Amino acid sequence: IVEGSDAEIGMSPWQVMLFRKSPQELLCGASLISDRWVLTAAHCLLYPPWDKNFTENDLLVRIGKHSRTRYERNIEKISMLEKIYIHPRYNWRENLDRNIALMKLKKPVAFSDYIHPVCLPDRETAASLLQAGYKGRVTGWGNLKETKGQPSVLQVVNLPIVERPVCKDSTRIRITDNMFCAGYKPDEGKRGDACEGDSGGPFVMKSPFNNRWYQMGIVSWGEGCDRDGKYGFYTHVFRLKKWIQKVIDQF
């Protein structure tokens, strides 16, 4: 994560890592939304342009890790996938629209001290929180700049939401309601941004209402990283809230 802090032990306990089975490889980021399901960016699992077309057995995940320059035994876990679920209308052709996907674990991780599931937005919240100016927290182990740059500890960072017209223009990609964008503007005081390898990671907010963390977006994409005049886009988790259940109810 470009221009951002270093995490506090057990800060984003719903953090997940997406691994290529063999060869064991770091691919993307993810969020734990219960003891059986994991959210994520659709493109991590399916992106024909970089010839990417994974199936349950190509990957595995690690939950509750803080540092890679170590291995916290009895702390971190490593589940296996029992089935991936990419959004039907996911548009990898034009604009990575609906870029979202759920993954079922073969066996349900147990919530520990450092492993807890994040909450999903309810019409009520999303309507009130997801406003321009409010802030959310982006987490990942992605690049630390734009070009290697690989961190050893989970990078956090907090970015305000931008108005739709600014994003709608800051890019030449047609952005839908399944996406929003955050980051500081040109001349704002601070900077920060997600970057390659962050995709599919969470973007929580803390409800001033019930005082809980709610993943509102999923890192989807961006032009370069942190470049002034440019804002990172996220999947509007609530929008596709619907889909997310039709998938869990069923199994």
Binding site: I33, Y114, L120, P160, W213
Partner: peptide, 29 residues
């Protein structure tokens, strides 16, 4: 809602992480 989004080593221990106020502040600001 069950028990989601409440960080054990924080909201359960009445501990704020070193950054949240910034957010809790961007509602007023």
């Amino acid at each position: 809602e069950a028990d989601c989004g409440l960080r054990p080593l924080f909201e359960k221990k009445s501990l704020e992480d070193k950054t949240e106020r910034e957010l809790l502040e961007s509602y007023i600001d």
